Amino acid sequence: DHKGRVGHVSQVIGAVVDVHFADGVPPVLTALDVVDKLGRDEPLTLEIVQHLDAHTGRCIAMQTTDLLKLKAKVVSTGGNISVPVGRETLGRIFNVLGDAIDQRGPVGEKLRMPIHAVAPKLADQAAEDAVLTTGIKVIDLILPYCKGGKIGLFGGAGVGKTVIIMELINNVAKGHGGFSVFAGVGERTREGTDLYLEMMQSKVIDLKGESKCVLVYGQMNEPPGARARVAQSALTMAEYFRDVEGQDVLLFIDNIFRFTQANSEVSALLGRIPAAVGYQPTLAEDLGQLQERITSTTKGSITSVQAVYVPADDITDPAPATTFSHLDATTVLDRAVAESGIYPAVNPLECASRIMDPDVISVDHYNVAQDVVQMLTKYRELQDIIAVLGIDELSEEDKLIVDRARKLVKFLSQPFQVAEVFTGMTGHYVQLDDTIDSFSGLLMGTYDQVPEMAFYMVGGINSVLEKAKKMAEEAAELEKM
Amino acid sequence: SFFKTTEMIGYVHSIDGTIATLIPAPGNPGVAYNTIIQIQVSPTTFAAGLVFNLEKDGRIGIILMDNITEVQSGQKVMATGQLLHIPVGAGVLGKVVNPLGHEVPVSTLGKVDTGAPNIVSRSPVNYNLLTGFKAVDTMIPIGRGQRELIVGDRQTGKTSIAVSTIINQVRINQQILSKNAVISIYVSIGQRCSNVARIHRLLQSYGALRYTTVMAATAAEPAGLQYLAPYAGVTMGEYFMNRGRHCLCVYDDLSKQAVAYRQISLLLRRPPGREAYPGDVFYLHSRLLERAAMLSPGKGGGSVTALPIVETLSNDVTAYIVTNVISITDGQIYLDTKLFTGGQRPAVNIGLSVSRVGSSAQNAAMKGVAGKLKGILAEYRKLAADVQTIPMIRGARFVALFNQKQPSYFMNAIVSLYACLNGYLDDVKVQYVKFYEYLLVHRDLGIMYGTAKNKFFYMYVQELNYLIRFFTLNSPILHGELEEMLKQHTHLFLQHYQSKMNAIKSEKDVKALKNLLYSCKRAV
Amino acid sequence: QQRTSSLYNKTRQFGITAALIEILSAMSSLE
Amino acid sequence: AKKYDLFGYEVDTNTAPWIEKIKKCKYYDEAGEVLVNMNVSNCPPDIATYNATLQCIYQSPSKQSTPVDNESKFCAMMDLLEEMQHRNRLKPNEESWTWVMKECVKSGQFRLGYCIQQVMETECKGCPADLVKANEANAQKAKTEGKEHPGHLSQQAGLFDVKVE
Ligand SMILES: Nc1ncnc2c1ncn2[C@@H]1O[C@H](COP(=O)(O)OP(=O)(O)O)[C@@H](O)[C@H]1O
Ligand SMILES: Nc1ncnc2c1ncn2[C@@H]1O[C@H](COP(=O)(O)OP(=O)(O)O)[C@@H](O)[C@H]1O
Ligand SMILES: [Mg+2]
Ligand SMILES: [Mg+2]
């Protein structure tokens, strides 16, 4: 039905394009190919977003709308924008539409699914409360990521979102029997190359043999129509591995703000009145239909890490604030923490996790993790007193809390394996058993005689005592000279 | 349910996500305002929608509800000519339901659009409603028919304190006459889908589904359902209210309802004002919360208690939607982010929180102890800012007692507070208050072979709860018998149990002491 | 404390003027 | 004879029709449903009506056909007393507390019985004897048979080792 139904371009205002159909308009979300010739190098494909009347329908362009004349011939596809799925996609790079953009021949496909799927019902939902050990101290201890969890990395410009996603791909996605999908939603085209090469070097993507990754990129260079829809294209591929193949899968959306921001561009041109802070009025609904599809069904299990840009370091902004409600482990990155020297720049008080609970994780995990949060809360109150009065003015017990709490802030830092170029030191995968025991002993006061800078930028307790030995030896030499 | 068609009022003209406008059919019948209309998406299937605008042209503005993907321009539109009615009653309990009334798989109807009880229809709130928290039930006491706001940041315990209030009713409801049972209605507006599932399992494990029904409009579902979800929640409660029974209504949350209503208003070209919300966004929450009330003796004496949740961004009460709901409700329960991370859970900021009808709402026994606690904590908070007095000692123990995960039973709460009031936990240190309270409730030291000899008053006998509510602790019947129980418990705890703390200064015993004390925070 | 509170209060009011001028300048473009 | 509500309107003091509805009781949750229906028809419960309800709580089994979890005729009974004393402002007469004493000895909860004979003796100055010896019999019954308290909780010497569950 409506398969090759012909229409003509009624109006062109930016990426938003109106189309007149003689025999009635197609349905909503229907993809339309612009058949007319023009002087183009690349094709044009329009997706209907609204209907104006029975014969006219408003659309958004996935490619640029350059050289588009009025009354240009337009033809329907059959349904929504269709994207290839299955194991033939693994190893290959894709765009919003599902065309291969890596110059390695035609894809093996054999099936295509629509980009705009409906979210699972209540009956399809299932909770599997197991800890996903990220090998990172601040995450595993304070806001542990769960299996099947939707996870969000909130932070402003240049804080360590892209660095943390890359470290999670090293730490978790390599030793994983499942496949992975990377939604490059409106981010740097140059960052996409470095991921493709580093995965080829480590052999998670393999040319000659078995691949365990899919790349779907709709970057900053692309117009808003693509950058909006490209998040869903990747999600359709992950949905195939979840529902059909019945499997545990990872999803990586960098960045989910760029989805909301892309919709904010079209929404203005579509003629909607903007809501708070100039965003689209359908901001909560846009995230709703996208984020609800990202979930652990009875058939399989998506485990999505997402990056979330906090514009102007304003966490009260609608784009992050609306996203926070959807997530299981909310990771919040602060600029002042980054500039002070602590990387990753995770502010643990604003963070939270659902599985931070005595039932899911062990009793020893919860009790130690709470004491770190409690001690850091006392430390922030004491930090205001030292600024006013002084370090000497504090009590005898409170001085010892400051010495431990200062070490807790330093020990929360960690040199990442992907960030060897930045830190100038080799990485550290810290085990969950190491993380809990080392922090437990620090709270007890077993490492009071250990110096403070020993804890800065190291892994577990063995690396702390190793650096403390090097500090003792070098301090002994300089004192002798 | 499958709604009742009548007349074909028009065709679908435009769609914009979850909103549409119609052109009238030949004749220009004109549908009635605020009524449901069924759009024929296929010959077999329909798609519901609510009428929001009746333009001069003849065009009719629609808010889409079901099968939004299946709606198209040029489709036929049938009218009901009636306001939205939904399934309501005892048969709906223990199930998840839409605002339209369809059950989610996992009874005479009632109007969702209804006027609130008038001046002579209501009465002063006297019946108490136990949240099961020593912090709340003393300082910010909720009465049946009251509207008590819950405000605070994300992950401060807004849902948990509301859900545990529903769970607290099961222990009473099981024992009491069903006339006075608190039937709960948890409305989930704009939440994530798995969060509703976890609450369903959590309600099921504590036997709450028997005395609870779950209204649900998740984030996947459209703005039309989210807008209408709290209204459908109250409708289900009003059945119990108008038929002489007491009810509870949690809206989680009104912040996401307002955003859904703003979407609807903006998409239909309603002039926006402050923070882009329409003119009547105050009226939205006002007519919702005013339907929650305490009826008179002349109309059954039933009730609908309201617990609206409203999320604040970085402790900002000056936001338009937050300030609106504060001015409607009878005070609030403020949840501070710094208290949450600091240790105090639930993180109830007592200075910021307030109940406008607190004293009259409380039980006679609870009014006795709580009147003194206001005097002690007032002096403790002042002296903490500016050498330990009696108020400083006893005040600090109350703060330790207010920490709790699951809700406390009325007997187990009031006795542990009465102990601290008369000063039974003065010699007991601050860190060992939860171990002292645990050994009071579950165990008992007097009976633990020796100095017992009480004729009736013990803590294992849970049935004394209702005798305490009648006579109070300060009374010739229970005063002397209670003060024995506490004297035996303190002397034995200080002698036998607290003596360990001077001793235990070794590895594997200090850690054993910690793990013991940390588990005592959870169980009250 | 006096002068910072005044700046908070000026920013509160100036924010809501600027918010609404932008929002209603949008629908003047949309008719 | 005459009575007025909080506003000052006339109120139906005709109690006797609603009393005979409570007598045809069968299960005691139906008594509450009648107590609702009186208030709905501007007829507040009389002092005799509460005693007629208290009778039905004692005589019948519990809520209805199926059993509820943790049934307690005493807790349902003592709630109704709290309603008449505090809210409705009515002192329960000698008949009221005698129904309470019967349920303690009938169900076997003697420990409550010790508390409520103290109540019945004080204030309302009456010692009904009949049930006092029947209550004291159940007290000695627990001692001589095995033990009176829970038993497994009492004897177990804790001191550092206490299970948290
Ligand atoms: N774990 C880390 N180790 C070292 N440097 C880091 C780390 N995290 C962030 N950075 C610093 O942050 C900068 C940019 O971070 P990036 O994640 O690319 O930005 P964004 O947070 O906007 O995604 C880098 O130049 C790097 O020096
Ligand atoms: N009284 C409490 N004691 C301990 N933990 C709590 C308490 N209340 C809430 N929490 C924890 O805080 C987290 C967030 O609770 P939630 O009710 O979802 O807050 P919000 O509704 O503000 O997001 C949960 O993981 C929960 O276990
Ligand atoms: Mg980045
Ligand atoms: Mg919540």
Side-chain angles (χ1 to χ4, degrees), chain A residues 5 112 119 138 151 164 168 172 235 240 312 347 434 454:
Chain A
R5 195 144 62 177
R112 273 191 157 187
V138 68
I151 310 154
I164 287 164
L168 290 164
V172 185
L235 185 52
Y240 188 83
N347 178 36
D434 199 346

PDB file of all heavy atoms in Angstrom, chain A residues 5 112 119 138 151 164 168 172 235 240 312 347 434 454:
ATOM      1  N   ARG A   5       3.847   5.960  -4.239  1.00  0.00           N
ATOM      2  CA  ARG A   5       2.868   7.032  -4.418  1.00  0.00           C
ATOM      3  C   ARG A   5       3.573   8.373  -4.620  1.00  0.00           C
ATOM      4  O   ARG A   5       4.362   8.793  -3.775  1.00  0.00           O
ATOM      5  CB  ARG A   5       1.909   7.089  -3.225  1.00  0.00           C
ATOM      6  CG  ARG A   5       0.647   7.910  -3.475  1.00  0.00           C
ATOM      7  CD  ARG A   5      -0.588   7.334  -2.789  1.00  0.00           C
ATOM      8  NE  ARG A   5      -0.472   7.299  -1.334  1.00  0.00           N
ATOM      9  CZ  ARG A   5      -1.433   6.905  -0.498  1.00  0.00           C
ATOM     10  NH1 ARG A   5      -2.618   6.493  -0.948  1.00  0.00           N
ATOM     11  NH2 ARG A   5      -1.197   6.906   0.815  1.00  0.00           N
ATOM     12  N   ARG A 112      15.792  -6.089   6.939  1.00  0.00           N
ATOM     13  CA  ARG A 112      15.807  -4.681   7.340  1.00  0.00           C
ATOM     14  C   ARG A 112      14.615  -4.392   8.254  1.00  0.00           C
ATOM     15  O   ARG A 112      13.503  -4.871   8.000  1.00  0.00           O
ATOM     16  CB  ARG A 112      15.770  -3.769   6.110  1.00  0.00           C
ATOM     17  CG  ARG A 112      17.142  -3.453   5.529  1.00  0.00           C
ATOM     18  CD  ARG A 112      17.103  -2.342   4.493  1.00  0.00           C
ATOM     19  NE  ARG A 112      18.403  -1.687   4.342  1.00  0.00           N
ATOM     20  CZ  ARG A 112      18.638  -0.602   3.599  1.00  0.00           C
ATOM     21  NH1 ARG A 112      17.664  -0.014   2.903  1.00  0.00           N
ATOM     22  NH2 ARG A 112      19.871  -0.097   3.546  1.00  0.00           N
ATOM     23  N   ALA A 119       7.971   1.045  21.938  1.00  0.00           N
ATOM     24  CA  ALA A 119       8.627   0.609  23.171  1.00  0.00           C
ATOM     25  C   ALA A 119       7.901  -0.598  23.776  1.00  0.00           C
ATOM     26  O   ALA A 119       6.681  -0.702  23.652  1.00  0.00           O
ATOM     27  CB  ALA A 119       8.677   1.748  24.182  1.00  0.00           C
ATOM     28  N   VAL A 138      35.628   4.870  41.659  1.00  0.00           N
ATOM     29  CA  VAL A 138      34.496   5.750  42.005  1.00  0.00           C
ATOM     30  C   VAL A 138      33.145   5.156  41.588  1.00  0.00           C
ATOM     31  O   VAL A 138      32.157   5.306  42.305  1.00  0.00           O
ATOM     32  CB  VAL A 138      34.638   7.172  41.413  1.00  0.00           C
ATOM     33  CG1 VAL A 138      34.529   7.165  39.894  1.00  0.00           C
ATOM     34  CG2 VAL A 138      33.629   8.104  42.072  1.00  0.00           C
ATOM     35  N   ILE A 151      22.592   3.691  31.873  1.00  0.00           N
ATOM     36  CA  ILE A 151      23.574   4.448  32.631  1.00  0.00           C
ATOM     37  C   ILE A 151      23.815   5.755  31.875  1.00  0.00           C
ATOM     38  O   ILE A 151      23.866   5.749  30.632  1.00  0.00           O
ATOM     39  CB  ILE A 151      24.898   3.666  32.752  1.00  0.00           C
ATOM     40  CG1 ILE A 151      24.664   2.231  33.231  1.00  0.00           C
ATOM     41  CG2 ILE A 151      25.834   4.370  33.718  1.00  0.00           C
ATOM     42  CD1 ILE A 151      25.747   1.274  32.782  1.00  0.00           C
ATOM     43  N   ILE A 164      35.604   8.420  29.599  1.00  0.00           N
ATOM     44  CA  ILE A 164      34.985   7.349  30.399  1.00  0.00           C
ATOM     45  C   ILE A 164      34.301   6.286  29.522  1.00  0.00           C
ATOM     46  O   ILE A 164      34.386   5.103  29.836  1.00  0.00           O
ATOM     47  CB  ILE A 164      34.029   7.918  31.487  1.00  0.00           C
ATOM     48  CG1 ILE A 164      34.844   8.549  32.619  1.00  0.00           C
ATOM     49  CG2 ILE A 164      33.127   6.834  32.085  1.00  0.00           C
ATOM     50  CD1 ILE A 164      34.069   9.462  33.538  1.00  0.00           C
ATOM     51  N   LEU A 168      35.376   2.359  29.437  1.00  0.00           N
ATOM     52  CA  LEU A 168      34.375   1.294  29.597  1.00  0.00           C
ATOM     53  C   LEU A 168      34.392   0.289  28.436  1.00  0.00           C
ATOM     54  O   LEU A 168      34.158  -0.902  28.646  1.00  0.00           O
ATOM     55  CB  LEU A 168      32.966   1.884  29.760  1.00  0.00           C
ATOM     56  CG  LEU A 168      32.662   2.609  31.069  1.00  0.00           C
ATOM     57  CD1 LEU A 168      31.416   3.460  30.914  1.00  0.00           C
ATOM     58  CD2 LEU A 168      32.509   1.635  32.214  1.00  0.00           C
ATOM     59  N   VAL A 172      35.094  -3.278  29.785  1.00  0.00           N
ATOM     60  CA  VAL A 172      33.892  -4.130  29.846  1.00  0.00           C
ATOM     61  C   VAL A 172      33.528  -4.742  28.488  1.00  0.00           C
ATOM     62  O   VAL A 172      33.259  -5.937  28.420  1.00  0.00           O
ATOM     63  CB  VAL A 172      32.674  -3.329  30.386  1.00  0.00           C
ATOM     64  CG1 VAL A 172      31.456  -4.235  30.574  1.00  0.00           C
ATOM     65  CG2 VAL A 172      33.036  -2.628  31.696  1.00  0.00           C
ATOM     66  N   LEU A 235      19.694   1.936  17.781  1.00  0.00           N
ATOM     67  CA  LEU A 235      18.803   1.244  18.712  1.00  0.00           C
ATOM     68  C   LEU A 235      17.994   0.119  18.059  1.00  0.00           C
ATOM     69  O   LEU A 235      17.651  -0.854  18.727  1.00  0.00           O
ATOM     70  CB  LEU A 235      17.861   2.254  19.373  1.00  0.00           C
ATOM     71  CG  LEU A 235      16.911   1.767  20.467  1.00  0.00           C
ATOM     72  CD1 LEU A 235      17.664   0.998  21.550  1.00  0.00           C
ATOM     73  CD2 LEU A 235      16.149   2.963  21.040  1.00  0.00           C
ATOM     74  N   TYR A 240      17.353  -5.903  17.522  1.00  0.00           N
ATOM     75  CA  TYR A 240      17.394  -7.192  16.824  1.00  0.00           C
ATOM     76  C   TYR A 240      18.172  -8.234  17.626  1.00  0.00           C
ATOM     77  O   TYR A 240      17.706  -9.360  17.798  1.00  0.00           O
ATOM     78  CB  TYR A 240      18.007  -7.051  15.424  1.00  0.00           C
ATOM     79  CG  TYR A 240      17.898  -8.314  14.595  1.00  0.00           C
ATOM     80  CD1 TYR A 240      16.725  -8.613  13.899  1.00  0.00           C
ATOM     81  CD2 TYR A 240      18.960  -9.218  14.515  1.00  0.00           C
ATOM     82  CE1 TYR A 240      16.613  -9.773  13.142  1.00  0.00           C
ATOM     83  CE2 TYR A 240      18.860 -10.378  13.756  1.00  0.00           C
ATOM     84  CZ  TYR A 240      17.684 -10.655  13.077  1.00  0.00           C
ATOM     85  OH  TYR A 240      17.581 -11.803  12.328  1.00  0.00           O
ATOM     86  N   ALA A 312      26.316  24.719  29.554  1.00  0.00           N
ATOM     87  CA  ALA A 312      26.715  25.826  30.432  1.00  0.00           C
ATOM     88  C   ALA A 312      26.928  25.397  31.892  1.00  0.00           C
ATOM     89  O   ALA A 312      26.811  26.218  32.807  1.00  0.00           O
ATOM     90  CB  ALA A 312      25.702  26.963  30.346  1.00  0.00           C
ATOM     91  N   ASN A 347      31.908  13.683  40.777  1.00  0.00           N
ATOM     92  CA  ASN A 347      31.439  14.243  42.048  1.00  0.00           C
ATOM     93  C   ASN A 347      30.470  13.235  42.678  1.00  0.00           C
ATOM     94  O   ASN A 347      29.326  13.128  42.232  1.00  0.00           O
ATOM     95  CB  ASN A 347      30.751  15.595  41.810  1.00  0.00           C
ATOM     96  CG  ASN A 347      30.198  16.218  43.079  1.00  0.00           C
ATOM     97  OD1 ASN A 347      30.788  16.108  44.159  1.00  0.00           O
ATOM     98  ND2 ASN A 347      29.056  16.891  42.947  1.00  0.00           N
ATOM     99  N   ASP A 434      39.304  -5.627  45.537  1.00  0.00           N
ATOM    100  CA  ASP A 434      40.384  -4.688  45.873  1.00  0.00           C
ATOM    101  C   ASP A 434      39.812  -3.324  46.267  1.00  0.00           C
ATOM    102  O   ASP A 434      40.239  -2.736  47.262  1.00  0.00           O
ATOM    103  CB  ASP A 434      41.355  -4.535  44.686  1.00  0.00           C
ATOM    104  CG  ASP A 434      42.720  -3.966  45.081  1.00  0.00           C
ATOM    105  OD1 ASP A 434      42.884  -3.428  46.191  1.00  0.00           O
ATOM    106  OD2 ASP A 434      43.648  -4.066  44.255  1.00  0.00           O
ATOM    107  N   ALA A 454      50.633   9.454  47.992  1.00  0.00           N
ATOM    108  CA  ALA A 454      50.670   8.043  47.601  1.00  0.00           C
ATOM    109  C   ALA A 454      49.340   7.575  46.997  1.00  0.00           C
ATOM    110  O   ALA A 454      49.333   6.792  46.047  1.00  0.00           O
ATOM    111  CB  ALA A 454      51.032   7.175  48.799  1.00  0.00           C
TER     112      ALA A 454
END
